[PDB]
Ligand binder design. Structure first.
Ligand SMILES: Cn1ccnc1CCN1CCc2cccc(N)c2C1
Length: 150
């Protein structure tokens, strides 16, 4: 009963989280997941400022209202060579990664590890935060509030 959460650097408070390294988060689970990090789904404006500080990924994830990929450098296999906050327009499917925004993070690039999941609640799951440098933090808990997500 284990979940890996792979997390990025923060840029103006915004970071990317993937569950188990595969697209597998619903829109309801995304809000709950960010809440566990004392964070919210980013607005478009928050994501655009993050972009401007150096944030980019090659993964679709939820923000408030849309599913996006932030892109700085054109890559043909990431958002069809687009730059900017690329908005997913047409998809059949409902499960992506998520972005999260933490107001209490540093204003620009913060590439320190994440060492806590501060607002997780009591539960049976071993949740492991996995940083890109491999640093891990585990705790037993739960973050999902919606039954359809478990
Ligand atoms: C190529 N691929 C497939 C699924 N995700 C990716 C790229 C994103 N990576 C995937 C692996 C990983 C491991 C630990 C921390 C972070 N942030 C990441 C982010």
């Amino acid at each position: 009963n284990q979940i890996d959460l792979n997390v990025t650097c923060r840029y103006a408070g915004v970071f990317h989280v993937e569950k188990n390294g595969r697209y597998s988060i619903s829109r309801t689970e995304a809000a709950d997941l960010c809440q566990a990090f004392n964070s919210t789904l980013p607005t478009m404006d928050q994501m655009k400022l993050a972009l401007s500080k150096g944030f980019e990924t090659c993964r679709y994830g939820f923000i408030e209202g849309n599913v996006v990929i932030p892109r700085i450098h054109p890559n043909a296999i990431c958002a069809a060579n687009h730059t900017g906050v690329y908005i997913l327009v047409t998809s059949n499917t409902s499960h992506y990664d998520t972005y999260c925004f933490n107001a209490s993070a540093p204003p620009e690039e913060d590439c320190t590890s994440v060492t806590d999941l501060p607002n997780s609640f009591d539960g049976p799951v071993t949740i492991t935060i996995v940083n890109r440098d491999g640093t891990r933090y585990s705790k037993k808990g739960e973050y999902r509030t919606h039954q359809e997500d478990i």
